[PDB]
Amino acid sequence: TGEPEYVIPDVLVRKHNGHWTVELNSDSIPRLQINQHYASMCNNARNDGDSQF
Amino acid sequence: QAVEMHESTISRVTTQKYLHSPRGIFELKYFFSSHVNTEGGGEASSTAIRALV
Amino acid sequence: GQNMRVAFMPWNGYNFEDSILVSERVVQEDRFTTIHIQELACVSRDTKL
DNA sequence: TTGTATTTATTGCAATTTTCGTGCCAATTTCTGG
DNA sequence: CCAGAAATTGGCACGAAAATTGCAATAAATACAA
């Protein structure tokens, strides 16, 4: 009773047109984003504490 | 020297990173090894010597 | 299918309610024998060990 | 004509530990004569 | 056949080379109001 354990690679290397192509694993590359809804209220007409925050 | 950085950056970047190749899954640190002098001015990596043995 | 020599009559309750009585010569001649083919797969993967 | 607040541009050293190869020797396996 | 005499290996030590981490906020270019 058991099952083997795997590791998700960080870098992929393959051979295309006789040349070695190297890239990052697109399924595991971290990324972020800026929330436009909260950042779109950065207007001086609002409170100054809110603006500096 | 090849990428024009310090050795500390190379050491930190290649910690617990995994590379997938048509041969298998390896570590980025797995490709660094010592050498043993070969007659004629050549060098032999310890990994190659272990494989030969 | 196959061409069969057939009679329409009751036979001792063995063709009761859409039952069919078949001769042994039909079996001996392999007239309704079929071939079935099945596939099995073994996958060898790569692990961390 | 200029002085100030904002936006990007900064991913390298120097101790310090860990590891590399390799020689010396003492406790085990093989080589040779009556 | 058997006992006295020769190779084998792993621990320990040596210098030297290499991998590791503690340094945590700075400086230069650019736009605007007097």
CSV table of N, CA, C and O in Angstrom, one decimal, chain A residues 4-7, chain C residues 46-49:
chain,number,residue,atom,x,y,z
A,4,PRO,N,3.9,6.7,-5.2
A,4,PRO,CA,5.1,7.5,-5.3
A,4,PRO,C,4.8,9.0,-5.2
A,4,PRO,O,3.6,9.4,-5.5
A,5,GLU,N,5.8,9.8,-4.8
A,5,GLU,CA,5.6,11.2,-4.7
A,5,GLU,C,6.4,11.9,-5.7
A,5,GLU,O,7.5,11.5,-6.1
A,6,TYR,N,5.9,13.1,-6.2
A,6,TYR,CA,6.5,13.8,-7.3
A,6,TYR,C,6.9,15.2,-6.9
A,6,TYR,O,6.5,15.7,-5.9
A,7,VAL,N,7.6,15.8,-7.8
A,7,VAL,CA,8.1,17.2,-7.6
A,7,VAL,C,7.8,18.0,-8.9
A,7,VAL,O,8.1,17.6,-10.0
C,46,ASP,N,8.2,9.4,-14.0
C,46,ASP,CA,9.4,9.9,-13.3
C,46,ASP,C,9.0,10.5,-12.0
C,46,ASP,O,8.0,11.2,-11.9
C,47,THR,N,9.7,10.1,-10.9
C,47,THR,CA,9.5,10.5,-9.6
C,47,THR,C,10.6,11.3,-9.0
C,47,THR,O,11.7,11.5,-9.7
C,48,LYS,N,10.5,11.8,-7.8
C,48,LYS,CA,11.5,12.6,-7.2
C,48,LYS,C,12.7,11.7,-6.7
C,48,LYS,O,13.8,12.1,-6.6
C,49,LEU,N,12.3,10.4,-6.3
C,49,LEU,CA,13.3,9.5,-5.9
C,49,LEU,C,14.1,8.8,-7.0
C,49,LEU,O,15.0,8.0,-6.8
